[PDB]
Design a protein around this ligand. Structure first.
Ligand code: HEM
Ligand SMILES: [Mg+2]
Length: 301
């Protein structure tokens, strides 16, 4: 009589992922059997490819989750709002599928399985292939992940709802960024470091009172009476060298509150200042989703 977390929230250092964002085209009922088929497929792929260390998550937007849940629980869930009066655009969809593992080829098979399960019930809006880059750096050349919650125990504490109807579930935030690396390369390395809040090559934290309040770390390293507002990030670089490229931002949290506070901070709603990264990169999508526990995906019918 307990709850199991979906397999894709907690894994650390996976080298590849696929994110599919889609709208519900018909009766929301179609999502019931599809979701059950999908998590069964994941179990099948985990059995066939034990060395892939595969995990996946199926999550739902506010409108369809209120229908599937009958309005019970997920009290913080809402459509992703526009932040900074539009600085952060809003592209709220109905369904999010997140696949991650040590093997892109296995991820690809799982994505095909997801598409076959949901079939013509969904309208795919975005499919992004994330890849870990050299030294786990973002395409900007700064290491991404250093202060991310480490270890299953702490990641569970931060990402997984502990009790009540939603025990084992999590809130998910996805936001695709498009980097302008030409604009970045116009900046001196010291200017870039003051924009992030860490040194570039050695990845050393710059002290809070040495770095601008607009620095990324100053915007998102938030505390409430000394307790950090932590989140579990699963973000990865994506794109082509000659085309669109950037960071696919993805975070999980037991409370949507921690994510929203960081967004209000970055986009100027809190103190009128905004994240210095907007000098070379911008968000073009945005959505909030609820990732139920595995057994509730099994109580979908
Ligand atoms: C272009 C988009 C982004 C880039 C390139 C980026 C990059 C980075 C880098 C380089 C770090 C420092 C190393 C680390 O501790 O991980 C960092 C930290 C962090 N980022 Fe971001 N980030 C982006 C967007 C976001 C967004 C949208 C959020 C939250 C809403 C976020 C939340 C955080 C948090 C919580 C940390 C850890 C801060 C700390 O406690 O030290 N980031 N990011
Ligand atoms: Mg800190």
């Amino acid at each position: 009589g307990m709850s199991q977390v979906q397999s894709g929230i907690l894994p650390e250092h996976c080298r590849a992922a696929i994110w599919i964002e889609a709208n519900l085209k018909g009766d929301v009922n179609a999502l019931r059997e599809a979701s059950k088929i999908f998590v069964d497929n994941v179990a099948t792929f985990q059995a066939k490819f034990p060395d892939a260390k595969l995990g996946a998550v199926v999550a739902f937007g506010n409108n369809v989750w209120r229908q599937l849940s009958g309005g019970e629980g997920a009290d913080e869930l809402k459509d992703f709002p526009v932040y900074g009066k539009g600085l952060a655009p809003s592209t709220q969809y109905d369904l999010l599928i997140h696949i991650l593992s040590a093997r892109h080829e296995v991820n690809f098979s799982v994505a095909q399985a997801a598409l076959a399960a949901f079939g013509d019930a969904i309208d795919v809006k975005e499919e992004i292939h994330g890849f870990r880059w050299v030294e786990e750096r973002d395409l900007s050349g700064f290491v991404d992940g250093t202060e991310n919650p480490a270890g299953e125990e702490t990641r569970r504490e931060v990402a997984v709802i502990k009790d009540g109807v939603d025990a084992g579930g999590s809130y998910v935030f996805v936001q695709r960024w498009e980097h302008n690396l030409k604009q970045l390369n116009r900046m001196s390395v010291p200017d870039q470091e003051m924009m992030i809040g860490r040194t570039k090559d050695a990845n050393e934290e710059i002290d809070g009172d040495e770095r601008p309040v607009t620095s990324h770390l100053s915007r998102v390293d938030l505390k409430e009476d000394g307790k950090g507002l932590k989140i579990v990030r699963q973000s990865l670089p994506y794109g082509t060298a000659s085309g669109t490229h950037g960071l696919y931002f993805c975070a999980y949290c037991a409370r949507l509150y921690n994510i929203e506070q960081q967004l209000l901070s970055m986009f100027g709603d809190t103190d009128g200042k905004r994240d210095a990264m907007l000098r070379f990169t911008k968000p073009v999508t945005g959505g909030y989703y609820f990732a139920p526990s595995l057994e509730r995906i099994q109580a979908l019918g």
